[PDB]
Structure 1
Amino acid sequence: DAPPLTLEGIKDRVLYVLKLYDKIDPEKLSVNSHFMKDLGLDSLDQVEIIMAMEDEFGFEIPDIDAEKLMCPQEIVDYIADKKDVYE
């Protein structure tokens, strides 16, 4: 039960959730693509992404850490730290 996930697995998952979002075009996204700078979304879209990741991984991210991680690579780093990958 609950198999461990590697960093590339959660990376595939986060890029999949980003590609399934209508506001993100499926070509310009990257791990370090800033939401306000590289893509120019709003704060509400950032909280939408945070809720999508919370529902996808089935656990709650605190609001301060929800607003602090500001790139997909930060999301990958936080998920990999909380699940403690590469055991």
Structure 2
Amino acid sequence: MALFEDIQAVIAEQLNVDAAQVTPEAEFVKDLGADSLDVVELIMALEEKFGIEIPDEQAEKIVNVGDVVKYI
């Protein structure tokens, strides 16, 4: 819960969307309006604030915010 809101605030700030609509089912591209460049940036932004790597082979599998949350 503490983790989910921290990474919620980061997604909302990166993609310029309301935190209230950054829900576990929300897809970054379909639902939150981000392109490829936005997602890579977001992945880089998460890596810093949490000191992990998320190799591309998992980033290809995350798709929505809830999957990102679990990986962390």
TM-score, normalised by the number of residues in structure 1: 0.71
- The residue that corresponds to 1:71 in the other structure is 64
Offset from partner CA, 1:48-87 (integer Å, 9 cap, x none): 11111111101211111122211110011111xxxxxxxx
- The residue that corresponds to 1:24 in the other structure is 16
> Where does the alignment leave 5 or more consecutive residues of structure 1 unmatched?
1-7, 80-87
Question: Are the aligned partners of 1:69 and 1:75 in contact in 2 as well (CA < 8 Å)?
Answer: yes
Normalized per residue, the structure richer in helix is 2
Task: Give distance in 2, aligned partners of 1:39 and 1:59.
Answer: 24
Q: How many residues align?
A: 71
- The residue that corresponds to 1:34 in the other structure is 27
Q: CA deviation at 1:11?
A: 0.3
> Where does the alignment leave 5 or more consecutive residues of structure 2 unmatched?
none
SS in 2 for 1:20: helix
Q: Any runs of at least 4 consecutive aligned residues in structure 1 with deviations exceeding 6 A, and if so which?
A: none
TM-score, normalised by the number of residues in structure 2: 0.83
Task: Give distance in 2, aligned partners of 1:24 and 1:71.
Answer: 16
Percent of aligned pairs sharing the same letter: 39
Higher Rg of the two aligned structures: 1
